[PDB]
Amino acid sequence: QFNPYGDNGGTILGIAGEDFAVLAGDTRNITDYSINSRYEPKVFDCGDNIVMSANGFAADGDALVKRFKNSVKWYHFDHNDKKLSINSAARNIQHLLYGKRFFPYYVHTII
Amino acid sequence: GYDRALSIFSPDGHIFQVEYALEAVKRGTCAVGVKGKNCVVLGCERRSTLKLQDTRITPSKVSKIDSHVVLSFSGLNADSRILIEKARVEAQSHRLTLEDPVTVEYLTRYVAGVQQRYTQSGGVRPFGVSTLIAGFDPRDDEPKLYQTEPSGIYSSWSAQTIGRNSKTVREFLEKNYDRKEPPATVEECVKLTVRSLLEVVQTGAKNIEITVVKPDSDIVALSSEEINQYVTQIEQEKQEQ
């Protein structure tokens, strides 16, 4: 039967400093026991000084990051280019995620 | 499929259909309501274009929305039923979800919105009805009296009237109701109510029905006699001068 899903491995890490923050993650993408790419970036700059990663099932992680970035874009279009605070991005993402509560995004996500 | 805009603006800024809805209210029999210090009374007149009816089963003018709230109106009867029904349903729904019966203001605000809605929806004409909604909020004793109209507007009154000759009877109440000292009794409150109706009913023992609402779902309508007794004593107030 068709399984919607997959696992692309990788890991990721995010640490918050007093006036800085980091989000790291290997660049290896796998499937079962094969390597798909030794370099497939997984942490992104989304704008308004926010970096995010959605690790787990690649397809889901990408769709999410993509959906979020587009979310930031419209946040500007709708609130006179107001900057999206990290805390607001978080809440916005909760909604993005819980939106598929019954067909989840198979990803662990950090911003 | 029918959505013609029947309620639209005219050059002067009037919604004629809503305007004409009020004309239908002016035509309806009269209705009045005055609040006492521990009660509210609702009086209404009875037409006489045809007399030979069966008072037992002919629909009465004052209706109960819930055990603690009543609604009277002036205008098209058919139209009022629709509103009474909706009000009654909303009343039960509110209890079911909030676990507490509606407040008179709430039930009034709901009825008003339904009316307002019919003024700017396609394919429908406004309700040719104005109402007087009264009662006591749950676990409260301060009487409540509100009035609504086709436009969807609503507010509370110490006393008010609607229907034909409401003009006349309003004057009576304006110069007969002291907010300082409201009818401190159910009796003097019911009297003030009939007196005001007599101004227009022109001797109508059977052409006047009063209902008395007290706190804690205590509602009751007076019988011909009880009312007739108020008429009798009142006509003497006049003759004794």
Binding site: D78, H79, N80, K82, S85, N87, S88, A90, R91, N92, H95 | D3, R4, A5, L6, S7, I8, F9, S10, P11, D12, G13, H14, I15, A112, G113, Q115, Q116, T119, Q120, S121, G122, Y146, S151, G152, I153, Y154, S155, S156, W157, S158, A159, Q160, R170, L173, E174, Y177
Partner: protein
């Protein structure tokens, strides 16, 4: 007859224009925006001495940082306020923050032209425009204190001061002179109170008029009669003073 969304030869929408005529017949509403807050005042205008003047609600709270005043067919404003309140709360749920005053206003104005009998653009199921205009006043971290005028035309303007309703053109001219970029909240209160007194048919008192404001510190508050009555007194005095 003729389409509810037709254009006059002068490039205007009849229904929207006729809508404005209705608003002119409305009770006066005035708003003054200062660097200490925005003040909103309205003419109760009870139609009978029996009507309990405080059951007249022409000033309502959208959110703790947004409040508004209405003029014209006030019944039409309920769904507008409802939409507004929801939009405010909803924004907060999705973003964990306050809805910007302009955004909230933009949202309300989006309902404006959604009227017709089959207007090819979406599902604008409303038989006529709204017969009321609003003064939306609030505050947000990005543009501080703001005053907006939302009309049935869908367009909204930002004002430092604005008057809508029966005595508008009159009161508007007054505001022109009286308003300056350094008014205090107290000055603005009296000012609104004074301008209401001129345009109102009835003698202004703490019962046929109502004030309110919105300040970053305590948000939107509606002045209770006692608080206003004294400002009334304070005004009569400053006037008699010259």
């Amino acid at each position: 007859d003729r389409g509810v969304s037709t254009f006059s030869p002068e490039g205007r929408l009849f229904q929207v224009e006729y809508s404005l005529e209705a608003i002119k017949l409305g009770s006066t509403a005035i708003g003054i925006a200062t660097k200490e807050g925005v003040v909103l005042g309205v003419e109760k205008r009870a139609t009978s001495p029996l009507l309990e003047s405080d059951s007249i609600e022409k000033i309502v709270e959208i959110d703790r940082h947004i409040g508004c005043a209405m003029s014209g067919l006030t019944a039409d404003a309920r769904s507008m306020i409802e939409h507004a309140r929801t939009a405010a709360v909803t924004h907060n749920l999705y973003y964990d923050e306050d809805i910007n005053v302009e955004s909230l206003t933009q949202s309300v104005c989006d309902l404006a032209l959604r009227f017709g009998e089959g207007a090819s653009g979406e599902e604008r199921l409303m038989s006529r425009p709204f017969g009321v205009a609003l003064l939306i006043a609030g505050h947000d971290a990005d543009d501080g204190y703001q005053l907006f005028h939302a009309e049935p035309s869908g367009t909204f303007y930002r004002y430092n001061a604005k008057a809508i309703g029966s005595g508008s053109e009159g009161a508007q001219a007054e505001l022109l002179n009286e308003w300056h970029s350094s008014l205090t909240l107290k000055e603005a209160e009296l000012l609104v109170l004074k301008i209401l007194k001129q345009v109102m048919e009835e003698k202004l008192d703490e019962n046929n008029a109502q004030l309110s404001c919105i300040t970053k510190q305590d948000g939107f508050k509606i002045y209770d009669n006692e608080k206003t009555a004294e400002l009334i007194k304070e005004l009569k005095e400053k006037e008699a003073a010259e």
